[PDB]
Design a protein around this ligand. Structure first.
Ligand SMILES: Cc1ncnc(C)c1CC(=O)N1CCC[C@H](C(N)=O)C1
Ligand SMILES: [Zn+2]
Length: 139
């Protein structure tokens, strides 16, 4: 589990979205596994606007933050799950690091702010759905 709270927005994994996220849907993209919904309370998370390839992520399954090097946002093929058939997921960044199903939602951060959230994993690799290109989250 895990979300990003910026302004009047809540960003979550699309596969983890609630009935309330869908009833107040702003934008959603299956190819990215992202869903943004509106909120009444104001969010204080800062989104990074950068091209960093190093950061720190929160790993729920170990209650630890881990430093990682991560690839640039791209189309990476993701194995079939109870949420999606086997497809290419776009805007995905990979890193060598631990992840278990249940770790989706954990935030990835650099010195500039919030980079993205855990979205894929397995084989000792972890995937992060990037949010830095979503310039509208700040307006
Ligand atoms: C299998 C597995 N191992 C280790 N870590 C994780 C997070 C996972 C879970 C994972 O990769 N999923 C399941 C939920 C939907 C995801 C998606 N973006 O399509 C894919
Ligand atoms: Zn950065």
């Amino acid at each position: 589990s895990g979300a990003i709270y910026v302004g009047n927005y809540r960003v979550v994994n699309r596969h983890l979205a609630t009935h309330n996220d869908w009833a107040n849907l702003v934008w959603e993209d299956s190819s990215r596994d992202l869903l943004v919904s509106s909120t009444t309370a104001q969010g204080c998370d800062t989104i990074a606007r950068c091209d960093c390839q190093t950061g720190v992520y929160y790993c729920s399954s170990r209650r630890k933050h881990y430093p990682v090097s991560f690839s640039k946002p791209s189309l990476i093929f993701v194995e079939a799950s109870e949420y999606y058939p086997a497809r290419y997921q776009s805007h995905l960044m990979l890193a060598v690091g631990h992840s278990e199903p249940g770790d989706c939602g954990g935030i990835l951060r650099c010195q500039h702010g919030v980079v993205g959230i855990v979205s894929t994993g397995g084989n000792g690799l972890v995937g992060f759905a990037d949010v830095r290109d979503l310039l509208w989250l700040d307006e």
